[model samples]
Target: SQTKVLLDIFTGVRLYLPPSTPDFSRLRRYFVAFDGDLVQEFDMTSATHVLGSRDKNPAAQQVSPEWIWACIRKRRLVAPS
Candidate 1:
């Protein structure tokens, strides 16, 4: 690994899936790999956040694809749009 640590990026976050994207795949990969999970499922209402490929994604407030990179570069969560 690099000098940087693997931050607990989604440590406190629970997410709902569907209307997915390859971007969704990426986040899901890291999250599950960290937990030794391959295809785990969780309840929708239990999610603290939501994701989508288009409209109808707010509530936890429709975070975007750029939001992924935003958090990565910032090393923390930014407020949702």
Candidate 2:
């Protein structure tokens, strides 16, 4: 199955962004546009990554918005940082 499909690049990724995040809604729409699943509440077990500058959750891997832009710039999913 090496052929590319129309499925969004973020098809399988689940993300969580805290409420206080800047441009929260705009970012959310961007993610949705690319087909990323976002959780309204932080669910360590459910989200593949949590986007934020600095936050800690023993069971969650928190990432920065830059990573999202990186992926978007490349038009593909990059490894989580």
Candidate 3:
């Protein structure tokens, strides 16, 4: 589900690629918005939480451009006119 969320942002942000592994620089672009919401809505100490943390992302492999395009097309079909 995380992948789906990320891909949605990818389309929203108009990124040229789905983001590569090793260095998730592309993914970092969405953190500002996420961080803002996280601070406003989520508690900092109720559970596993880190505020304004710039920790490295998960060690997931690179998501292919084809997958990104697929997500785009899927959303396009269902989007409001």
TM-scores for all predictions? 0.59, 0.70, 0.23
Worst 10 residues of 3 by lDDT: 9-18
lDDT, residue 75, model 2: 88
Between the candidate structures 2 and 3, which one is better when assessed by lDDT? 2
lDDT of 3 by residue, 1-81 (tens): 345333333322222221342233533444332221222223323212221221422222233434433435565313222
lDDT of 1: 0.55
| Order of the predicted models by TM-score, top scorer first | 2, 1, 3
lDDT of each: 0.55, 0.71, 0.30
The deviation in Å at residue 54 for candidate 2 is 9.4
Candidate 1: residue 50 Cα off by (Å): 0.6
Top-lDDT candidate index: 2
lDDT at 57, model 2: 44
lDDT of 2: 0.71
How do the residues 15-70 of candidate 2 rate in per-residue lDDT, one tens digit apiece? 78776888778777777878888876746457767765324444556666777777
For every candidate, C-alpha RMSD to the true structure in Å: 4.7, 4.7, 13.0
The reply for model 2, stretches above 4 Å from the true place, is 1-7, 42-44, 52-59
